[PDB]
Amino acid sequence: IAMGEEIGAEMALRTFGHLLRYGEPTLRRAVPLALALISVSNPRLNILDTLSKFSHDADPEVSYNSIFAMGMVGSGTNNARLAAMLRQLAQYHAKDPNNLFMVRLAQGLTHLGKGTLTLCPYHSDRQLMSQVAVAGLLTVLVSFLDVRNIILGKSHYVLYGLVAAMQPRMLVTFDEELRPLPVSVRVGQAVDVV
Amino acid sequence: APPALWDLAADKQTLQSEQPLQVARCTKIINADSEDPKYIINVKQFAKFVVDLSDQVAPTDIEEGMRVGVDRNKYQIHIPLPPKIDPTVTMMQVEEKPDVTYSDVGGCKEQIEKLREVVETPLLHPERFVNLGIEPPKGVLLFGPPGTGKTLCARAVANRTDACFIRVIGSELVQKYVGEGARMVRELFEMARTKKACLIFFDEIDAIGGARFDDGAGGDNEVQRTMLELINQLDGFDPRGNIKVLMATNRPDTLDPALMRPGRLDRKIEFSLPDLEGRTHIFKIHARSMSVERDIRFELLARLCPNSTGAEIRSVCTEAGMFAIRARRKIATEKDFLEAVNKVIKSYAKFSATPRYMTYN
Amino acid sequence: KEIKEVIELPVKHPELFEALGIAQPKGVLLYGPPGTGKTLLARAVAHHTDCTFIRVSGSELVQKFIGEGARMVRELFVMAREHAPSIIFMDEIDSIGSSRLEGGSGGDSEVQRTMLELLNQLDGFEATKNIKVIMATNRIDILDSALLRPGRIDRKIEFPPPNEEARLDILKIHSRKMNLTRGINLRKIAELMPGASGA
């Protein structure tokens, strides 16, 4: 349903909804993964609405794939509901990379290759990464996220956009976005190339 | 499902624990006890029985006209149950949870403090009246514009330190089937006494306290009960009410509880109401809101707004953000809304002066 | 020659309603003497089309018999969802006696509102076609209908006083079952009854 259907209008809500409601258990983990294609139309209404109830789930796998399904398709446009949602996300006591993968990847939805001069100031992101790195204390994953937000934050130089406005799809991301769905050790590293 | 799986597991122990105590039906009030062995009990099933007890129940621990459990075969005495009435209109009227604490005050200092010394100051230390007491006073009086009514109760909601007190909605007191709420106001106080001094507040006490009368024909007659019925609830010696009371209204009438309050209650105080000063706090309720432009001034707007209450002038600072988002203005300058303020005051004072002075006069 | 276009075109035609481009007529009334046949016209045209027929309150005990308590007009509005096309009627409030100028106003106000909130639940929102309402009065409230009618929303038709035309045949209509010879004069039997009523 993800790749086999590409059109301007969604029209896939009936089948995408039918497979999750009629599907067997544990399949709902990989269901939201179709959001990287058909959600390029109007992700503001559908994505944060749906994934809001699944973002509070205690299962780390569905939580990993929820913030992941939002991912890049929802990082093109900003909003205050996202910035106000960032609260209480990093205050959870849950271990494992899923917590800092939920929060830090959600930080990347504010803008893509925009700033900082022109436009948004970088001091706010520096204060956020400085205050969030004081916990645990290491937990070197905080040294993973403080470089992570500045990956797309401080690189810039590339407008995407989507990729792409001409409607090619990035052939690295998807492939790389597939493997960590079970990320154990090194596979999420090959996805860092992004 | 692991909740649901463990959920159907112990029905075995529930069905084994089912046979004992299951026949405890029906909830039944007793009538009289002539001597040691004998009792007579009365139910609403129409069943009335003069019948004995189960040995687990002692005679002196039980009260007359008391809802009890029974095994209707022997018609024993299983256990007495304290509660009687009332249904969820109570649980609607009875309220819990905190919110809206002190700091939401719009700058009124000793207007709320004169009534802060009446309620939570004695509730902070009921021991305070051991040495000096005498008494925590009987009741109060409150009325004025809307601003700010029932939020002082909300102020008491968050700052309540003991037990969740009970709001009272007016139009549920007036009812069909004469004497419906008559039971309530009577019986809910024991339900409030069940909470051992947990306070009560009545809203729309002017509507439900209706006074006084016309020759014919009521109409008010059945409601003429409730007022004097509350006065009977006032004339009940005990406690009264261990909850004190807090009462907010609009007009000086109704007179009968207002002329009964010098016969019982105390502490007649008043809104607050607008002031030349406190508007700056009602304009500082927006202080930490938005980000105040460095050149935005309070006194400039505060001196321009007479008889402001708190209501509109809270939206007065808010209608900047109205035209802000509409005109794309990133933040607002005081000149922006004060253009629409002198509008919104006049435009809304053209038809309505909201004569609060006239309401109670 | 008027009401028929109000009724059958929503039953037969409607695909050509949009050809003209206007929606269903919201209602209609016949005002005049109270008066005869307007209620027949109601149920007969309901029978002419076979579309089911409904009335207004209704006492006393047709109310809680549907539901428990409410605005109470929604359940009646739900009745028409079960059966369409349907005909709803105001029974009767055709009279000069219910006025009182106040005490009958509010009694009529919700009888007036029974069309209004229905017109507001017909045209205002919900759906769709085939539902109609009928009114009847003489005077007074007919001018009070203009208070409800700055054009919104109804059809205005007058209920005629009787005349010799019907008097001949409508008696002949009643004369079908009775035993009478043919030599009866229709002239004098008609013309001896000026005014009076349809009753």
Binding site: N79, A80 | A4, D7, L8, D11, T14, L15, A24, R25, C26, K44, L81, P87, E95, P146, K150, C153, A154, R167, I169, S171, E172, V174, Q175, K176, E204, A207, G219, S289, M290, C317, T318, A320, G321, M322, R326, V344 | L9, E18, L20, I22, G67, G69, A70, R74, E75, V78, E102, G106, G107, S109, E110, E117, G124, E126, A127, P150, G151, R152
Partner: protein, 341 residues
């Protein structure tokens, strides 16, 4: 799996319908159900023992009367009067020239739900609702605004306090549930059309006196006041007579908005008229301007309904086309409708 084939015998063979009433705080739930039969249920499954709550219904065993399951049953007049659904096809592009009026309420219809950010980026919290009014009879032109609001969230329109005036209170209570079932449907929108409370005087059926009708409106706001309700249900309210309402309704809410409806001007009538006759084909001599140019102080309903008279005779001849020779002459009937009627 096996639990389904286990407790079905405890359930079995049948099970009754009880009425959930009260609880012993040990979670032995005392119920009054026909006829006034109690029980004590602490049972482990399907509960959610808390939220089933007093003042509800239950389903009881025969031996002995344990509630093994519960339902939410309506139907009822409660849910029926709020819905369904609808979203009729009309839009806010239908009424032009008054955009100054709707562009005001644009942010009021937009900012809740859609485009919420700059509400909370300003953080000034303007969720105060709206009030409406205007001459002479308007508010369906505001339904032309309300028919557009159906693009977002969910909506209910109510008419008057009539459900209270039908009988001695009864309180607000039917308004209470309509108010707190909008919390069940929250977020939503609710509107009451043309408040007649003390505007109209006499009542249908039995009612009185003034104060009980005065307080059921006074409780209408005081419940909406409220203590202390965040629930929206963004409240839209209207009456075409600003007089009779108690002026205290404005300050708690809606404070900021009561829409003034201007009467149509010459070009507004021009802007409005062609939207109707767009579908109805005019004849050669038919002109929008001259007729409404000479006519004065019309209504949008009339200028919409003036086309219906030609929808008679031309449809009596069964013609798809309007004729101004009739539309002039037939306009006299609607002119007679406004003049003499």
């Amino acid at each position: 799996e096996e639990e389904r084939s286990k407790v079905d015998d405890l359930r079995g063979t049948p099970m009754s319908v009880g009425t959930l009433e009260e609880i012993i705080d040990d979670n032995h739930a005392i119920v009054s159900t026909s006829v006034g039969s109690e029980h004590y249920v602490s049972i482990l499954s399907f509960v959610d023992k808390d939220l089933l709550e007093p003042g509800c219904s239950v389903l009881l065993n025969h031996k002995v009367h344990a509630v093994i399951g519960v339902l939410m049953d309506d139907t009822d007049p409660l849910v029926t009067v709020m819905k369904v659904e609808k979203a009729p096809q009309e839009t806010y592009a239908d009424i032009g020239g008054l955009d100054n009026q709707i562009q005001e309420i644009k942010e009021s219809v937009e900012l809740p739900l859609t485009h919420p950010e700059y509400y909370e980026e300003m953080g000034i919290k303007p969720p105060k609702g709206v009030i409406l009014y205007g001459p002479p009879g308007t508010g369906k032109t505001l339904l032309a605004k309300a028919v557009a609001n159906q693009t977002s969230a969910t909506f209910l329109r109510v008419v008057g306090s009539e459900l209270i005036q039908k009988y001695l209170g009864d309180g607000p209570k039917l308004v209470r549930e309509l108010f707190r079932v909008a919390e069940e449907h929250a977020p939503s929108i609710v509107f009451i059309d043309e408040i007649d409370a003390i505007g109209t005087k006499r009542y249908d059926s039995n009612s009185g006196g003034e104060r009980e009708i005065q307080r059921t409106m006074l409780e209408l706001l005081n419940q909406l006041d409220g203590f202390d309700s965040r629930g929206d249900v963004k409240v839209i309210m209207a009456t075409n007579r600003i007089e009779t309402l108690d002026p205290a309704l404005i300050r708690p809410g809606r404070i900021d908005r009561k829409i003034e409806f201007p009467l149509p001007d010459e070009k507004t009538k021009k802007r409005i008229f062609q939207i109707h006759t767009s579908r109805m084909t005019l004849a050669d001599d038919v002109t929008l301007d001259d007729l409404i140019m000479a006519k004065d102080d019309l209504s949008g309903a009339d200028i919409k309904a003036i086309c219906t008279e030609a929808g008679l005779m031309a449809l009596r001849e069964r013609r798809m086309k309007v004729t101004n020779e009739d539309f002039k002459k037939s306009k006299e009937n609607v002119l007679y409708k406004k003049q003499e009627g």
